[PDB]
Design a protein around this ligand. Structure first.
Ligand SMILES: Nc1ncnc2c1ncn2[C@@H]1O[C@H](COP(=O)(O)OP(=O)(O)NP(=O)(O)O)[C@@H](O)[C@H]1O
Ligand SMILES: Nc1ncnc2c1ncn2[C@@H]1O[C@H](COP(=O)(O)OP(=O)(O)NP(=O)(O)O)[C@@H](O)[C@H]1O
Ligand SMILES: O=C(C[C@H]1NCCC[C@@H]1O)Cn1cnc2cc(Br)c(Cl)cc2c1=O
Ligand SMILES: O=C(C[C@H]1NCCC[C@@H]1O)Cn1cnc2cc(Br)c(Cl)cc2c1=O
Ligand SMILES: [Mg+2]
Ligand SMILES: [Mg+2]
Ligand SMILES: [Zn+2]
Ligand SMILES: [Zn+2]
Lengths: 483, 482
């Protein structure tokens, strides 16, 4: 039974939803959480989709070491020194001090790029396109939250190297679109594609692209995934070079990208679609789409009810519906109703003795709570149609929620007003770091830049000025409070 | 390849794994990069094993890599001898942690306290969980790519049951799946058995194992492990329930655990690899057939030759053969032949202009080097037949190799002579630990350890037969080992 209310105490609601749905168990180490099968199945679904898509682009999976030597991690300016407090260091095996401390990967640039340098011995060795599914550790300073901000997390990280900037540029947007597909088509979460400002972009790259989602309940936006064009920044640092085809004796530096997406996805799904009855799973990622529960309780008559439930589950597996028959005798129908509702199963298939004799059943959709009596003969078609509509409804409702909470403002006064109402807002922005710092300080709790959107809500007025008082606007920029 | 397998195994192994593009070396000792060619084998193993354990009702999950100091030391989960293998995180940045944190060497200490919370009644059992994850053990022993690494990839399955019998059943089901991984996928013959008292997992009831033999080394290697833990861990962690029908009695869960690692790939390499390089069993080969255009004619004709190679690719994909067309024009056919030979692609398909005009192609088997001219129309049928034959060929060769190198001995001196010829030996054994300590010392004066007590030993132990030492309990496989 879900106790807490989403609009009252979000922290309590979230904790209750992730535990009662059997997604998460708490660990004795801060910021670490056990991913039980219910949570892990969602990651496997995201993985199956994304992996097949990057394979089509020619990306190959690999596995690089988790340990990075002190030398390698600090070899070059791969990361700003401000990341130092996030690195977890192994310093001994048993009671025996290691000659040099070793770091647990916070990301794999420093481990992969020296290998890239060895492997690139001519123009013929490019492109290199590698991905790995692995765990990552960062000793996060912010309050830890299951999925959203964890000390250990699962991710994929892709790292590509090309001869030309144009090849690289294409991939950045192709991957970002895949991330947008993960959120919008799998998880039914609308996102805003954009580029990070000078201040917020990855310091090791030329430009950073991002997808941003919004969590209404929190009044906070969240970065869903990241895709960088690194340019020649890392290839100059690690000497990833090839001979110029036309001119003898000239070095050419490889163009590089990196991109990543994490189990944060599941938290966003939870925060966006979850209600006061628990988790709500988009049909596309639900490992159980339909749960069959026998209702009502002769000895031979119960055998026939079970047989009908088994008939429904056999037929549903025939049309590639992911179905579970909960034929357990140790649990009451009521318990089961609640159990699978908390777990967010899109459709409950109720079979009673009364409905069975009328050659019919009841379909209860998780999202709206709507109950539909349908005839037995149309089980395959109707249930597949309801699953499709649940997926559409979840996306539609979240889209209207984003449309409501993301508006335009052109002055600092209206900006403050809209941000304090629990919304994010697109403002004319000069792009300066000075001004961005100033925006953060004045609104503080303080609003941060999220992205410069690819497709802003409004076009910029001819000669429009920044929310500042000294500079013209370069672009509409999405600002808000964030995770 | 510069080195030869029969003279310098270590040099050969290093050359095979690098020139097949499986492994790159890292600057941390005992840590190796798995490039795509290696990682694809692991994905193939994963795909098979994952599907099979799902059929048994096992679900995947992910438990944390970090084990708190207090959790690692809470119960007698592992012997004290393991302590030096534990890698400890002691600081974040320059800030020392109040209490140090261990990296997962295995997950009992993180999983079993969760199992104890999750089991509130009989209806909470069985629990059947698996994770695919990385593990760290600061190995004192000589590290080798795949076979013995400081970081490795594995699956660990941990199950809890209401009854001993359910648990006992799963133990042998999992060991058979490991045998299938070796025998059916990687074409490696293995010996199923129980570990001796000295060699078993200390806290468990009994340990079952699959042992493989690497002829080049004259050394055996454990391929996978499946333990019945009985109620030993459930008593420690309080994984308990009470049955209302049996009032006043605590029912401790019966547990198993089991694991298999990337060592698999190293065994495959060591067993099937030759002096031309890697040899991939077709069942795990991510590229089963490579199509190479030869004898390259106008651009129009070159286009036609490429289109023919592409037509073979589509036809092969159509019958579920994993195929690649190496259509790169920066390299010669001769360079490609060698390149894919080194990578152990089972079949090379040669297509030249004369072949097109004749309606034929050339297929070359990696395992034997046999070159066959095949009628164009028979491509799907013949190449599938050849792939099936390569797999059988590899398994037969390896099977005949084990059978030759595993024989029965009945005395300490016969045992010694056979062992020193680079073989493994089934001997009458009493079962006592001290006797096994004695054997390891005597055989060295590079000693021989117990491998397993085979489920189906070569010879039946006659009543009243004495140990090589006490009367013998069973024939036991012994040998030099990784
Ligand atoms: N501690 C964390 N736990 C879970 N997911 C995370 C965490 N940190 C980042 N992510 C997500 O995973 C991706 C990690 O790539 P990265 O670009 O390194 O994030 P980041 O720049 O550190 N973000 P932030 O820490 O919010 O400033 C991001 O796009 C986030 O969606
Ligand atoms: N360092 C390693 N690298 C790769 N594989 C390993 C390593 N250690 C063990 N394995 C394999 O993975 C399984 C790990 O389970 P486990 O029972 O912990 O091995 P173990 O008893 O430590 N073997 P050993 O180290 O030879 O005494 C074993 O069956 C081995 O096949
Ligand atoms: O991790 C990145 C850059 C990109 N790496 C590959 C996948 C996608 C990802 O956006 C930014 N980043 C974030 N956090 C970090 C924390 C530490 Br500690 C270090 Cl050393 C380095 C970093 C660091 O480089
Ligand atoms: O890891 C095991 C027992 C089993 N665990 C689950 C997967 C299969 C595996 O055989 C034996 N073992 C091996 N090596 C270890 C190293 C260290 Br360090 C520790 Cl703390 C503990 C252990 C330890 O328990
Ligand atoms: Mg961060
Ligand atoms: Mg060991
Ligand atoms: Zn400004
Ligand atoms: Zn003896």
């Amino acid at each position: 039974g879900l106790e807490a209310k989403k609009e009252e105490n979000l922290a309590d609601w979230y904790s209750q939803v992730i535990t009662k749905s059997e997604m998460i168990e708490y660990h004795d180490i801060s910021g670490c959480y056990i991913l039980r099968p219910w949570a892990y199945a969602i990651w496997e679904a995201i993985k199956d989709f994304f992996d097949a898509e990057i394979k089509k682009l020619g990306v190959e999976n690999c596995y690089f070491p988790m340990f990075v030597s002190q030398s390698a991690l600090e070899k070059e300016k791969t990361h700003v020194a401000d990341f130092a407090p996030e690195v977890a260091w192994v310093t001994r095996s048993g009671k025996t001090e290691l000659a040099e401390p070793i770091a647990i990967r916070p990301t794999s640039e420093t481990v992969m790029y020296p290998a890239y340098a060895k492997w690139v011995q001519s123009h013929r060795d490019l492109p290199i396109k590698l991905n790995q599914w692995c765990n990552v550790v960062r000793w996060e300073f912010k309050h830890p939250q299951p999925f959203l901000r964890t000390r250990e997390f699962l991710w994929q990280e892709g790292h590509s190297a090309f001869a030309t900037m144009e090849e690289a540029a294409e991939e950045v947007l192709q991957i970002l679109d895949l991330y947008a597909q993960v959120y919008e088509e799998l998880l039914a979460i609308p996102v805003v594609k954009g580029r990070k400002t000078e201040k917020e972009k990855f310091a090791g790259g030329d430009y950073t692209t991002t997808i941003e989602a919004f969590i209404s309940a929190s009044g906070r936006a969240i970065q869903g995934g990241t895709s960088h064009h690194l340019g020649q920044n890392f290839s100059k640092m690690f000497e990833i070079v090839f001979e110029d085809p036309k001119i003898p004796g000239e070095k050419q530096f490889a163009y590089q990208n990196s991109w990543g997406l994490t189990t944060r996805t599941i938290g966003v799904m939870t925060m966006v679609h979850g209600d006061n009855m628990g988790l709500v799973l988009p049909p596309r990622v639900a490992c159980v789409q339909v749960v069959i529960i026998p209702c009502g309780i002769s000895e031979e008559d119960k055998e026939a009810l079970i047989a009908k439930c088994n008939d429904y589950r056999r037929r549903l597996l025939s049309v590639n519906i992911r179905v579970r028959a909960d034929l357990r005798d140790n649990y009451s129908p009521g318990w089961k109703f609640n159990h699978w509702e908390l777990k967010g199963v899109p459709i409950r298939l109720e079979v009673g003795p009364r409905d069975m004799k009328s050659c019919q059943f009841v379909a209860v959709r998780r999202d709206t709570g709507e109950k539909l009596t349908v005839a037995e003969n149309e089980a395959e078609t109707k249930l597949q149609a309801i699953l499709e509509d649940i997926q559409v409804t979840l996306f539609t409702r979240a889209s209207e929620d984003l449309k409501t909470h993301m508006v335009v403002a052109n002055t600092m006064e209206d900006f403050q007003k809209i941000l304090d109402s629990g919304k994010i807002v697109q403002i004319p922005f000069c792009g300066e770091i000075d001004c961005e710092d100033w925006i953060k300080k004045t609104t503080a709790m303080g609003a941060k830049s999220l992205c410069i959107p690819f497709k802003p809500l409004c076009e910029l007025q001819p000669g429009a000025k920044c929310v500042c008082g000294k500079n013209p606007a370069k672009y509409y920029t999405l600002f808000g409070r964030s995770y």
